[PDB]
Amino acid sequence: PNSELNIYQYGGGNSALALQTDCRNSDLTITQHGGGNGADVGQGSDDSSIDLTQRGFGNSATLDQWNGKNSEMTVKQFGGGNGAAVDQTASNSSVNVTQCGFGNNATAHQY
Amino acid sequence: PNSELNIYQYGGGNSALALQTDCRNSDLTITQHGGGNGADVGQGSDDSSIDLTQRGFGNSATLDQWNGKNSEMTVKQFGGGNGAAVDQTASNSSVNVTQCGFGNNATAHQY
Amino acid sequence: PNSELNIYQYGGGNSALALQTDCRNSDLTITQHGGGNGADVGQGSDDSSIDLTQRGFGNSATLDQWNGKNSEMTVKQFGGGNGAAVDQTASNSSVNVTQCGFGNNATAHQY
Amino acid sequence: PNSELNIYQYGGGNSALALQTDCRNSDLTITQHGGGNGADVGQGSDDSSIDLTQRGFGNSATLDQWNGKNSEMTVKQFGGGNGAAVDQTASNSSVNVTQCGFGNNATAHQY
Amino acid sequence: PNSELNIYQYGGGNSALALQTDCRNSDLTITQHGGGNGADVGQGSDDSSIDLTQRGFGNSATLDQWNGKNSEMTVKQFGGGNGAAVDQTASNSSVNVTQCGFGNNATAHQY
Amino acid sequence: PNSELNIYQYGGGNSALALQTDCRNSDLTITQHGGGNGADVGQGSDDSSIDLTQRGFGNSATLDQWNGKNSEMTVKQFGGGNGAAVDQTASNSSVNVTQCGFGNNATAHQY
Amino acid sequence: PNSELNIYQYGGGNSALALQTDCRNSDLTITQHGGGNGADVGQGSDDSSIDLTQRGFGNSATLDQWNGKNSEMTVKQFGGGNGAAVDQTASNSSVNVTQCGFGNNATAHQY
């Protein structure tokens, strides 16, 4: 099972927690640009992907992709203080969240 | 097999376009409070729900839920100039967008 | 059972209440142009259609189509302060109200 | 039962009340031009028609068709202050009232 | 069982503690350029590799790769005061941490 | 094969090169205190130990423990500018070099 | 074969060259105190020992122990400019050279 977890941080004060378990041929990528961005990502889904990109300051993301197969996550937060929380369990399914600006809130649930 | 689509406007200058076709056992609800809020919503998903509530001024929402089953979409825009675009094709899934404040932008795509 | 309920509002201060239940293969359409127009429309009839058009200011319509089949109801209110009250329960039946001008009152019941 | 109720009002201050019940394959039509004309028309007869035409001001009409079949009732009031009172219950029968000018009163009963 | 642990230190004030136990056909490499960089690396995984490179000043790294097989760790800290903490126990898995700038904190967990 | 290679540096300008290959059940330790100390150490010997201690400034040590078994090398350099060059291939043998002061040169070979 | 070769140097500028080959259960020890002392020692004799002690300045020693068994070699040079050259090959034999003062020269051969 070729499973890859990548964390790239540029700037200062960004924090990332990542978990990949029982997750075969799947990719989890976190890329944070700027400052004070927080990420918490769990992936336990086969042939699945999670891409998290935060660019700016004070953005928060909590992502959970569990039990699914052939499933995709994209989260892109541009700006300041945006909040994202997503759970994805559906198979052959995809979730996309894109927040631009200040103070955005998004919660997504796919079963 | 009951299908309901509802529009409520309170205030002035709010505009709503709604479409429900091939959409069985499904509810689409559109409620705007205030002024200048714009909504364009399409629902063709069985056993599915759309709820958009706009409260404030200049909020814009474009919602599309097609080919899904047992799917729920909720968009709530509080304040001014919030923008939301939501696409929903997954079955047994939920999208929730909650925008608070001014100038918020959110696009959610869930397949 | 393609059931569609459409409300289009252009201008300011228009209010529409629409209800569609137990209503198969049926369309309800409300179109408001101008200002201060009030609409209350309920439809529970199979293979039926409601068409309410209000163009002007201060027009009010109360429209109820219940327990009929293959029934068409149309109200067209042009101008100011027109009042229409229409109840339709007869099957395979049509009601048509046309008001032009100011201060008109029209009552129609079809059983 | 293709039953149609039509109200056309042009001008200002005209009032029309129309009732259609148990009235199959039948037409009720009211046409008011001008101002202050009053109409009260009841229709409960199968395959039968009412045509009321009031053109002018201050004309009053009280019209009832009940329990008839294949019955035609036409009232035409041109001008000002004309009063008409017509009751029709006979089947396969026709009532025609024509008033032109000012202050005419006409009463017709057909059983 | 060819097990190699290499440490290269250039400059001054860099300190590194490295432990390799029960770790067959596996490579652990530490390379520090500059000053005041701290490293603590434990490797007990078969056919696994850990590569740590710190370039700059005041960077801190804590890396634990345990019980895995065919597992890769890459940690690269460029700049000042970066902190990294990574634990990997998953087999056939890869963790990559890259920090650029000042004051980054990165945590990686892979089981 | 529990094989551990540790280098501790306290102070500034110290440089340490260490390689451990084909070396089962063996420890290589380098400890540098002060400034500008240079060490290069290779270990390929089974059940062997390397202890290099440099305390001061400008000390240089070149240590090669190859093809031996049950072999110990200890080199201790206190002060400034000491040079030691030691090669050890003999099995069940021990080499001990102690330099105190300034400008010492010592060469040790054991086959 | 427990074979030990130890060189202890205290002071400055001391130089020692030491060779132990084919020499089982044997000890070779050099102790130099002071400055400029030179030692060159080869040991290839079984169950035998070499002890060289130089205390002072400018002392020189060339010691060769070969093909003997159960042999002991001791040279003690105290002071300045002392010279010692010793070859031992005899079995069950001991050579002892003691030089005190300045400018002493001693040659020992035992076959």
Residue numbers in the entry:
A (entry chain D), B (entry chain E), C (entry chain F), D (entry chain G), E (entry chain C), F (entry chain B), ...: 41 to 151
Q: What do the authors say?
A:
Curli, a prototypical functional amyloid formed by IDPs, serves a pivotal role in bacteria. The curli system consists of seven proteins encoded by two discrete operons (csgBAC and csgDEFG), which regulate the assembly of a major structural subunit, CsgA, and a minor subunit, CsgB, into curli fibrils. Using cryo-EM, we have shed the first light on the cryo-EM structure of E. coli CsgA fibrils, revealing that the amylogenic regions of CsgA adopt non-centrosymmetric beta-helical structures.
We chose an engineered CsgA with two designed cysteines (A63C and V140C), developed by Balistreri et al., as this selection offers several advantages for structural analysis. The chosen box size corresponds to the number of included CsgA monomers (the length of the fibril) for generating 3D models. Acceptable initial 3D models were generated by using box sizes of 218 and 260 pixels. Fibrils comprising approximately 7–8 CsgA monomers appeared to exhibit high stability and uniformity, potentially indicating a characteristic of CsgA aggregation. The CsgA fibrils model indicated that the adjacent strand distance and helix height are approximately 4.8 Å and 19.1 Å, respectively, exhibiting the closest agreement with those (4.8 Å and 19 Å) shown in the predicted CsgA model. In addition, our E. coli CsgA models also confirmed the previous prediction that the core-facing residues between beta strands are imperfect repeats, leading to the formation of steric zippers that are non-centrosymmetric.
